[PDB]
Amino acid sequence: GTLSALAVDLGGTNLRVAIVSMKGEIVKKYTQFNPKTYEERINLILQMCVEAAAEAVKLNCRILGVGISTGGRVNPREGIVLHSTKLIQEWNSVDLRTPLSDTLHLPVWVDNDGNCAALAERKFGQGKGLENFVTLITGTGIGGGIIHQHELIHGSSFCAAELGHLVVSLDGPDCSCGSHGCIEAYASGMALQREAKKLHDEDLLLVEGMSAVGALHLIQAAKLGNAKAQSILRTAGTALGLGVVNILHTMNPSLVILSGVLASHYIHIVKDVIRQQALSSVQDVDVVVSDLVDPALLGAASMVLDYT
Amino acid sequence: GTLSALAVDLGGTNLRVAIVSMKGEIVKKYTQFNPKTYEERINLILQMCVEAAAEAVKLNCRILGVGISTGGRVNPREGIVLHSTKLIQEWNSVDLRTPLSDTLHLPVWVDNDGNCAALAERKFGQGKGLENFVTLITGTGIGGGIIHQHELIHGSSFCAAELGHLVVSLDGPDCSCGSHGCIEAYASGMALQREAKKLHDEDLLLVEGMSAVGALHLIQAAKLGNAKAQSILRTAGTALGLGVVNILHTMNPSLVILSGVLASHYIHIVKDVIRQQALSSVQDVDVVVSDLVDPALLGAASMVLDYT
Numbered sequence A, B: 001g002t003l004s005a006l007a008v009d010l011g012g013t014n015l016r017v018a019i020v021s022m023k024g025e026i027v028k029k030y031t032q033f034n035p036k037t038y039e040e041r042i043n044l045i046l047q048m049c050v051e052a053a054a055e056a057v058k059l060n061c062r063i064l065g066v067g068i069s070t071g072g073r074v075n076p077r078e079g080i081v082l083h084s085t086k087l088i089q090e091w092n093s094v095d096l097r098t099p100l101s102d103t104l105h106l107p108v109w110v111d112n113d114g115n116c117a118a119l120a121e122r123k124f125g126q127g128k129g130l131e132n133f134v135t136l137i138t139g140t141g142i143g144g145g146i147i148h149q150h151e152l153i154h155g156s157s158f159c160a161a162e163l164g165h166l167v168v169s170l171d172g173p174d175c176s177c178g179s180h181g182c183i184e185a186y187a188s189g190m191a192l193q194r195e196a197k198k199l200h201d202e203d204l205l206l207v208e209g210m211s212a213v214g215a216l217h218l219i220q221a222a223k224l225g226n227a228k229a230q231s232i233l234r235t236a237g238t239a240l241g242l243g244v245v246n247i248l249h250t251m252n253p254s255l256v257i258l259s260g261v262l263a264s265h266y267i268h269i270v271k272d273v274i275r276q277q278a279l280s281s282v283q284d285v286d287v288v289v290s291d292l293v294d295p296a297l298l299g300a301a302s303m304v305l306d307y308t
């Protein structure tokens, strides 16, 4: 059999389960909405993992374990989701290792989704071999992961690299975390979706050449000359850039990897903000867009593949 | 002889040279203004060190080496000041080890002043024994130092822990670093001095019970009910607090140490901002005011004392 992992990724919108090969190929991926309650969510994770495990046999893949990427603060040693922002409701003090390992008879690893993104970039991506790098993954929310001396920083209370909650305003838009002025509150998918929905509500988004509203609509409108959309995207990208400047002046990594579909749209503004505002000693920092399709899911697999 | 170090601290205002014992007692300290040019500055450092070395003999202290704390990005391995903001002009690509070691016939260590502050807190202060902690030192500028796994983080280009240049506004006041919205531009001594000088210019600082204007005047006025002074100090303290929140959500240290005379004035507002805005998983972070008189100078001594 192809040595493989089962990988789960639980984000602000979607719950995905995949069979991933030891080379980082996604063999098969199942996608559902992340349910809004604990009971539904745990049951769906189990269902999807059991079905994926059965298909793996039919696809001749030998599953070595299960890795779970999730939003929230996580204790990876104990496989417990400690605390989540409201992007995932009813997801506090949750033992994921026990129910999954009991159901599937497999070892189970769990980490925060940004930390998994970092692990993917270290194994399969542009972080391979590097002593220090940081990643920011834009999705519903913004996740972060920090590699220092080749290893993740988890922090004294497993809250390191909550990079979506870097604050770049004294005021600013409200964040789902309960704060305001967080980069996530400016630049996440959810933030852009809201701003697009607000413009579309006021008949102010659509422009000649387009016609369920989201971040990509705002970006399309901006390419097609919508002035309000361009301004929103500049503000968003500037905020993210300032988050990155904070990271540079804190950790001073050699490389920043931006991932998620919005990364390509933000990279130039992030580079410009660094150029215009960061200290000269961090100007040699490389800022790139990830070459991985799905860092969090790949990073969940990497925990199994490297540690089983 | 009492085993001792010579310690130099070069900040935004003052150049100090001290004889420091292996127990962290400042035996004797000399103070001058930090000159504004390279030639004057290097000559004064040398003068003051030669005089301090001669007095050490008369005080029966055996000097084991020289440690230098300086503002700027520093390569400690080579003893070179790489780049400085304009708080210290003409302080770029400067080899400090060679001229000092040639003049004094002593080994010489050099690091950034915030990194020295961290080293002092690790040896003599509230950081002793801790795997991870961060310090912010408020003076003319704001300096930072990060201990992770018991050791300083210097970063990939010696620009880690430039914590005064954490950005907490999309706009905000200009920073001497050339950016705007940096915590230093809100909350440093220089920032408060400027704001006090601005009020005093408009006859708006003095209040019944007081009568060369600086940060302590603004703070005195605020205690005595000056509404404009209280508001400025709240803004300043909120900005610093947000800097700290960024640190928590980046590194998630167990302890944050605030030092410099302004620390006592800011600690309650910093704690309040953390309370009101940071994630619940960092709420257990201890935030304290330093118990050391002069962390940078003590930390410069600690390099000699621990490594000679």
Ligand SMILES: Nc1ncnc2c1ncn2[C@@H]1O[C@H](COP(=O)(O)OP(=O)(O)O)[C@@H](O)[C@H]1O
Residues within 6 Å of the ligand: A010, A011, A012, A013, A014, A015, A138, A139, A140, A141, A188, A189, A190, A193, A214, A215, A216, A260, A261, A262
């Ligand atoms: N192709 C796309 N490009 C940009 N944003 C997208 C795309 N598809 C979904 N999104 C946005 O990203 C979020 C869903 O992305 P995903 O990475 O699946 O999120 P999560 O990990 O947060 O569940 C939503 O905000 C949605 O608008």
Ligand SMILES: Nc1ncnc2c1ncn2[C@@H]1O[C@H](COP(=O)(O)OP(=O)(O)O)[C@@H](O)[C@H]1O
Residues within 6 Å of the ligand: B010, B011, B012, B013, B014, B015, B138, B139, B140, B141, B188, B189, B190, B193, B214, B215, B216, B260, B261, B262
């Ligand atoms: N006792 C004090 N309390 C608060 N601020 C002070 C005090 N003495 C000096 N300052 C301020 O701090 C700066 C000088 O402090 P110092 O720690 O000697 O600075 P540096 O390391 O920046 O040379 C100036 O902004 C000055 O107004």
Ligand SMILES: CC(=O)N[C@H]1[C@@H](O)[C@H](O)[C@@H](CO)O[C@@H]1O
Residues within 6 Å of the ligand: A011, A012, A070, A071, A072, A073, A083, A084, A085, A086, A087, A088, A112, A113, A114, A139, A140, A141, A142, A143, A144, A164, A165, A184
């Ligand atoms: C559920 C929750 O707390 N999510 C956080 C953070 O932990 C995630 O990494 C991030 C990206 O999904 O979203 C949010 O910022």
Ligand SMILES: CC(=O)N[C@H]1[C@@H](O)[C@H](O)[C@@H](CO)O[C@@H]1O
Residues within 6 Å of the ligand: B011, B012, B070, B071, B072, B073, B083, B084, B085, B086, B087, B088, B112, B113, B114, B139, B140, B141, B142, B143, B144, B164, B165, B184
């Ligand atoms: C000269 C210079 O670049 N100083 C910086 C920083 O390096 C210092 O640590 C800080 C405190 O002195 O001031 C400034 O923020």
Ligand SMILES: [Ca+2]
Residues within 6 Å of the ligand: A112, A113, A114, A115, A143, A144, A145, A160, A161, A162, A163
């Ligand atoms: Ca993270």
Ligand SMILES: [Ca+2]
Residues within 6 Å of the ligand: B112, B113, B114, B115, B143, B144, B145, B160, B161, B162, B163
């Ligand atoms: Ca520093």
Ligand SMILES: [Cl-]
Residues within 6 Å of the ligand: A086, A089
């Ligand atoms: Cl809700």
Ligand SMILES: [Cl-]
Residues within 6 Å of the ligand: B086, B089
């Ligand atoms: Cl100048």
Ligand SMILES: [Mg+2]
Residues within 6 Å of the ligand: A009, A010, A011, A012, A113, A139, A296
């Ligand atoms: Mg995801």
Ligand SMILES: [Mg+2]
Residues within 6 Å of the ligand: B009, B010, B011, B012, B113, B139, B296
């Ligand atoms: Mg000083």
Ligand SMILES: [Zn+2]
Residues within 6 Å of the ligand: A164, A165, A175, A176, A177, A178, A179, A180, A182, A184, A185
């Ligand atoms: Zn937030």
Ligand SMILES: [Zn+2]
Residues within 6 Å of the ligand: B164, B165, B175, B176, B177, B178, B179, B180, B182, B184, B185
């Ligand atoms: Zn600055």
